[PDB]
Amino acid sequence: KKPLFTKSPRNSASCESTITLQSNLLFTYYKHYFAGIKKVALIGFPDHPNKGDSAIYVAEKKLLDALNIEVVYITAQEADYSASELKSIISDIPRDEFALAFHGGGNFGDLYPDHQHLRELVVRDFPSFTTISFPQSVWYNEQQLLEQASILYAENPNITLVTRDRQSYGFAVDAFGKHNEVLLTPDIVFFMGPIPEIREATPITHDVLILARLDTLNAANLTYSVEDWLLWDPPVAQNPDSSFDDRGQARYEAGAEFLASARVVITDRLHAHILSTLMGIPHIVVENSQMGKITNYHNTWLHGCTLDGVSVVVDSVDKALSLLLEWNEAGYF
């Protein structure tokens, strides 16, 4: 009953509506495109410390569970991929009940040839199945790399590409839109819905958390942490005998608790921004890169969460601190 953002109740209603909209669109799109599917192989599981990519995995599980679809196989990298093992797993499954699902996020571009290569390997071993991605960021600065990657999608018109932001959508359409369906949906993590439970369960350890690149102790009676949520990793994730699911769950929960430790967050990471929004943690986001790592997504989907006490975007970390103080005297956290 109570607002997601306590301390900014009227503005909270607008962002809660926006969360619900994104969650419904995800369901509506994926219910349709997974019609008839009962079992799925997940391709490109993020077996590495990035908290946002693991949160993407958990939200993918949640959506698949909501559609009564079972994950019967997972591959992270080429090294752990086995065509024989996957061939045997799907031998007993009717063709129209099985799909290939590409793990979403920012794994489609110049910097991610291994992720693309795994997609190529799996689709060519198992062609003519319902094949679709979870919502991706997509961009190639280099034509040569784009031309290479385009052959897979041209030769397999059944593959449906899902993008999560307007710039990725426009790029995907121009590059692959002749042969493949291209969609624009929200980021899958919004299917988790409001998750204030974890905000309330986690004890507050600092007043502010700075999850961004850089110091200045403006002593307005506020403690702060300048930690990075990359690098460090839950011990369970470091275990080789642990399952993919265990690693992804642990990394998601760890990342969520990490943000919950503060009353306000300053961040330049998209999924620190997304998760804080879902948990009802007030936060300022810093767009300090070119490209648009934050702003491409934000301007596509989150206009309704762009409010005082909820979430705001600024062009620098110094601007974030200034606004933080206004929020403090306003009592937004």
Next chain:
Amino acid sequence: KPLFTKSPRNSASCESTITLQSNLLFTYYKHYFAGIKKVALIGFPDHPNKGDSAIYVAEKKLLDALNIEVVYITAQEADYSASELKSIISDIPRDEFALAFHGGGNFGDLYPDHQHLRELVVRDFPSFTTISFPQSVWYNEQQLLEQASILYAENPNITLVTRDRQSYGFAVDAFGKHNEVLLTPDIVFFMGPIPEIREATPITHDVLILARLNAANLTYSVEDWLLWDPPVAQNPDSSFDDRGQARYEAGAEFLASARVVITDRLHAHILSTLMGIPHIVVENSQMGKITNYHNTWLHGCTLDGVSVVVDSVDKALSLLLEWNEAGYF
């Protein structure tokens, strides 16, 4: 009972696609019309184009489904009255009233009057929930784009809805700094499957060529659905609703008179899809008048017996014959 009876398996795929588009329209507009009870429709198409009138009826249908009443309609500047609209909304709470821009292809170089009416209405009535029905949007001329951009920059509350990929990309680059821009299906898909009017209309010709070999035994008509107009639409004492309804129904019956349609019009293509009439679509222009929309939304209706796109009218005839011997119509 399939929508496309002579292509039952392929019909299922296109019916799903219709349902998807209808649900997205509802989901988006339910959200963005939250709290709204009454609406003024701006840019009503008071002219013979059948597709634009079909857009109007679908707009009515959606508004009715959200329990929203249309309390005012303006087609052109000549019939617009600020005083009349001001008095109509005087007793309505601010947050219960919205301005709704009539959708379709009325946003670009060729449509300065449509844009001008939008400018007039928003500046007389600023700070209301303001949103468009799904539009096609493109400006070839920078000078015209720059002029039209001022309205949307000065009124950040306006939400722009586009109906295709290219329009969305254009709208985003041009207006995306200040305004929300959406990509939804074309509003006419909220009508859902309408085979009733296909079944009610008697077949007059075998083929209808609605665009710019004969025997083996196929009759054909090369009519244009512009120009001619139901007599009720020509009546000045008729209401906007009557004209729009009549023009929609007339356009629908016109397509229903054939067993197959060849067309180069987007809404002949859309309506034929909804009615379950097999048809071939011809993309004979440069702009992508058909293909921008089709490739955004209708991959699932791109099947034999349902609907196919080709680059010329000659190609359409060739495929028609394959469909005839297959028995797709």
